[PDB]
Amino acid sequence: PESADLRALAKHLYDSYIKSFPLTKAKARAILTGKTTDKSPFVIYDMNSLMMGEDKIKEVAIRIFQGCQFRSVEAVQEITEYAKSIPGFVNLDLNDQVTLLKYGVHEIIYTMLASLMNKDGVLISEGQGFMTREFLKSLRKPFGDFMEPKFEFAVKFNALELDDSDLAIFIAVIILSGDRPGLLNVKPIEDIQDNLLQALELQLKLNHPESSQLFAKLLQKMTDLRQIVTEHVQLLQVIKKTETDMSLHPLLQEIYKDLY
Numbered sequence: 001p002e003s004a005d006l007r008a009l010a011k012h013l014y015d016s017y018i019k020s021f022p023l024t025k026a027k028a029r030a031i032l033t034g035k036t037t038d039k040s041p042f043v044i045y046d047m048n049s050l051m052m053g054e055d056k057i058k059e060v061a062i063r064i065f066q067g068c069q070f071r072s073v074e075a076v077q078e079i080t081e082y083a084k085s086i087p088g089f090v091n092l093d094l095n096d097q098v099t100l101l102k103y104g105v106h107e108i109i110y111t112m113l114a115s116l117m118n119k120d121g122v123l124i125s126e127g128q129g130f131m132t133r134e135f136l137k138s139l140r141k142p143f144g145d146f147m148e149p150k151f152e153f154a155v156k157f158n159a160l161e162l163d164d165s166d167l168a169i170f171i172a173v174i175i176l177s178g179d180r181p182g183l184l185n186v187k188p189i190e191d192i193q194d195n196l197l198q199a200l201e202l203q204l205k206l207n208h209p210e211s212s213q214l215f216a217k218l219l220q221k222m223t224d225l226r227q228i229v230t231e232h233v234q235l236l237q238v239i240k241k242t243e244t245d246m247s248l249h250p251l252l253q254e255i256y257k258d259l260y
């Protein structure tokens with residue numbers, strides 16, 4: 001409950017975040033800005049560069065989508081491992097652990113996705129490639145509409161200039177949301193989130209002392225996340241109806257089953 005308890009929690013989460021997520025914001029920024037700690041990506045900006053890129057790194061929009069499913073499944077695996085490290089999470093009723101993961105994992109995906117983006121495109125294939133926003137926008141409907149709202153969010157989110165240590169606490173706050181539909185015991189979840197929110201506030205005060213009220217502004221961003229999810233779900237429903245040769249991977253299918 002004291003500051004030292006809050007710092008210890010911040011430290012624990014950052015340590016777990018680094019252990020759980022092999023591609024950090026620090027690495028993403030090093031790739032994107034040309035630092036010598038990391039290597040230059042191959043840039044895919046049209047159909048030709050895409051074909052050459054697969055060699056360097058079934059309509060194309062569908063192949064890209066199926067690749068997205070696999071990255072997303074990996075993301076869920078990483079996020080689940082991380083969630084289990086949040087103090088108190090694995091002590092919750094198992095139904096609630098499942099519910100929290102079900103509603104939270106994509107909110108986390110879009111949050112961390114911002115780390116891989118700038119206004120012009122997104123890192124892919126563990127940072128080995130970079131696919132432009134213009135190219136993704138050019139994919140046939142409805143595949144061309146998947147990424148744009150995520151890019152719009154990312155530009156706004158990236159303006160906050162958070163680092164990995166900040167993000168570690170923020171994503172924990174997202175997971176421990178007491179307002180998820182169908183939760184059985186809201187209070188112990190809120191008890192954990194209250195601790196995480198305090199730890200995040202202190203972390204932001206110490207790590208960005210010249211960023212006044214960064215905490216409140218960060219919380220402002222969480223509104224956009226649920227809207228991204230809502231819009232995304234509508235696009236998935238279209239795909240389900242128009243592309244019968246495809247289904248979501250079973251883990252993703254479970255996540256979206258009876259969501260909202």
Ligand SMILES: CC(C)(Oc1ccc(CCOc2ccc(/N=N/c3ccccc3)cc2)cc1)C(=O)O
Nearest residue numbers: 068069071072074075078108109112113146248252
């Ligand atoms: C059906 C599916 C897969 O639809 C999606 C379509 C597009 C997107 C956005 C781009 O896909 C990404 C997949 C993984 C990403 N990042 N990886 C991590 C890993 C660990 C932690 C955080 C992020 C980024 C983008 C997403 C989904 C779906 O809804 O699952």
